[PDB]
């Protein structure tokens, strides 16, 4: 779900999000999304909101009080206005009972506002529930047509599968860097690997249950992960009363990864080798 194209589509009269901040939509993954598109007058844009009342809210489109999602509205004068009148847009003006949240009504039965039955034929005290939205280019900003899309994000017991794009960044190697691969976070050096992964397998583990090989998602390559060098620092020194000179031994560390001498114990700095 790329919300970036939604943001940059066009200037929007309203981009109001209930229950979720607009910035966190990309980084949050929802189970399902529902896009509800319709066209209403500019005055009725505010009626598409939880806890609101009106003709559109009661009889056309109702949102729950605990609705999680966003409502986006934008002007569509060039598309939904004609000099003769665009009568192709209709709204429900009369209904027996208020619409439940996320409910639609397509019945065209004549509204019965009187004791006498309407008998299915329009007449006195009987009115058509559906009225035409006579949009015109010269109408005031309150009455100009507006396209409204409501995004409803729902989470269920099923695993979530809808969210924003995953950044690729770049690939670096031969350096102790912080790596994040498909939620596997750590630090290491991603050198070349002679191992051959099976297409299904993404990770690789040592005998002692630790990750040692990984597969790159962007390009199907195998990288050997080696932890960054670490060791113990030991200080070689005579008595302080004798002198104040010291030498430092990095245990088990190659001398090129830190009066320098290389020994089997580690790298020695500050001491001179003699025969």
């Amino acid at each position, epitope marked *: 779900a790329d919300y970036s194209v939604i943001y940059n589509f066009a200037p929007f009269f309203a981009f109001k999000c209930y229950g979720v901040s607009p910035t966190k939509l990309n980084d949050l993954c929802f189970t399902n999304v529902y896009a509800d598109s319709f066209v209403i007058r500019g005055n009725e844009v505010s009626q598409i909101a939880p806890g609101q009342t009106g003709n559109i809210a009661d009889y056309n489109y109702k949102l729950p009080d605990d609705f999680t999602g966003c409502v986006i509205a934008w002007n569509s004068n060039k598309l939904d206005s004609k000099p*003769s009148g665009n009568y*192709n847009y*209709l709204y429900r003006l009369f209904r027996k009972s208020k619409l439940k949240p996320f409910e639609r009504d397509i019945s065209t039965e004549i509204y019965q506002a009187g004791n006498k039955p309407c008998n*299915g*034929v329009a007449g006195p005290n009987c009115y058509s529930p559906l009225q035409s939205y006579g949009f015109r280019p010269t109408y005031g900003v309150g009455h100009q047509p507006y396209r409204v899309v409501v995004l409803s994000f729902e989470l269920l017991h099923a695993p979530a599968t809808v969210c924003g794009p995953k950044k690729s960044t770049n690939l670096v190697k031969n350096k102790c860097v912080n790596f994040n691969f498909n939620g596997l976070t750590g630090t290491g050096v991603l050198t070349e690997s002679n191992k051959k992964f099976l297409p299904f397998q993404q990770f690789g583990r040592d005998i002692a249950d630790t990750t040692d090989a990984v597969r790159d998602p962007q390009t199907l390559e195998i990288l050997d992960i080696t932890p960054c060098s670490f060791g113990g620092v030991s200080v070689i020194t005579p008595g302080t009363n004798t002198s104040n000179q010291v030498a430092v031994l990095y245990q088990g560390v190659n001398c090129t990864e830190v009066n320098v001498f290389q020994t089997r114990a580690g790298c020695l700095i500050g001491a001179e080798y003699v025969n």
Partner: nanobody
Amino acid sequence: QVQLQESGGGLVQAGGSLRLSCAASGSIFSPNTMGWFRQALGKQREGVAFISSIASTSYWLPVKGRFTITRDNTKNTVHLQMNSLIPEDTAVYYCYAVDKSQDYWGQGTQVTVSS
């Protein structure tokens, strides 16, 4: 994509008869309701009559006898029978397919009467 075929219009003298026909090909999902609208010359658009999928008819003008709606379940088409034609019904007609999700519209038929 839905195509609503409109046919059966033209010039008819006063008191004549004709048969408008709308055939809905394309999506036209199962719980459909079919209707007819009227567009007088330079005026508003009112609803001629609507027929549902359970044969229930709702005429939106005191016009019973004038329009009669016939349903073809095998092809999911709707025919409007016009009789006793009088000059005040001279208007173009579009048929309205609500479907279930996205409603559609016709192309147009010229219905004219004068003497």
